[PDB]
Design a protein around this ligand. Structure first.
Ligand SMILES: Cc1nc(COc2ccc(C[C@H](NC(=O)O[C@H]3CO[C@H]4OCC[C@H]43)[C@H](O)CN(CC(C)C)S(=O)(=O)c3ccc4c(c3)OCO4)cc2)cs1
Ligand SMILES: [K+]
Ligand SMILES: [K+]
Ligand SMILES: [K+]
Ligand SMILES: [K+]
Lengths: 99, 99
């Protein structure tokens, strides 16, 4: 679809058999999700942004659906205030900025 | 222009008679720029990122150019690791998501 930005660009994703709402984030290189139940093995990792850094877990090759479009990528779980879909995923569903 | 997302969406802004490189961030309610000389009054204010909170100065009605398009809005100056253009401004140059 086409998304104007007068309202946070919130979409609906389904990961690990759960439904959630992530923010479409161009400024994010990575996909970061609040604490959640995900199967498989993972890695410790740290990412940073405004205000500081946070230690998160890294999951690769995990299936995720973003507002209808399927995609398989790297999801990072950890103490982020909101769900974020980053360019690593935004790239797969062919998302783009236009103006 | 249709900015694809395989590389961070960096664009050229011009504020305070100075040129800078900022990130086009859809997941950003506000525009935040690293420390810089900016004329006019302001108001202290804290904002929260993925890592925590930061105290930034808030300037209003500050003319700015993003990739050639003139816009006037609220700009926040503070300890942000990157220059960020937020939805408050993106909507001013007609920037939108699409996929
Ligand atoms: C009250 C509270 N309100 C809140 C609001 O909660 C939010 C809401 C959104 C975000 C995401 C973040 N935005 C952001 O800091 O925006 C700020 C400017 O105005 C305000 O509006 C929203 C929060 C705040 C960027 O869009 C992506 N980032 C890159 C920029 C900032 C450099 S990153 O740090 O998150 C990131 C993500 C993934 C990455 C990465 C970096 O590097 C590699 O992968 C963070 C906290 C929290 S507590
Ligand atoms: K979905
Ligand atoms: K999976
Ligand atoms: K410019
Ligand atoms: K001005």
């Amino acid at each position: 679809p086409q998304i104007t930005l007068w309202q946070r660009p919130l979409v609906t994703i389904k990961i690990g058999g759960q439904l959630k709402e992530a923010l479409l984030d161009t400024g994010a290189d990575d996909t970061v999700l609040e604490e959640m139940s995900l199967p498989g093995r993972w890695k410790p990792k740290m990412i940073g942004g405004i205000g500081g850094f946070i230690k998160v877990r890294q999951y690769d090759q995990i299936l995720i659906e973003i507002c209808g479009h399927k995609a398989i990528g790297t999801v990072l779980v950890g103490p982020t205030p909101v769900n974020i879909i980053g360019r690593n995923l935004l790239t797969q569903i062919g998302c783009t900025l236009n103006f």
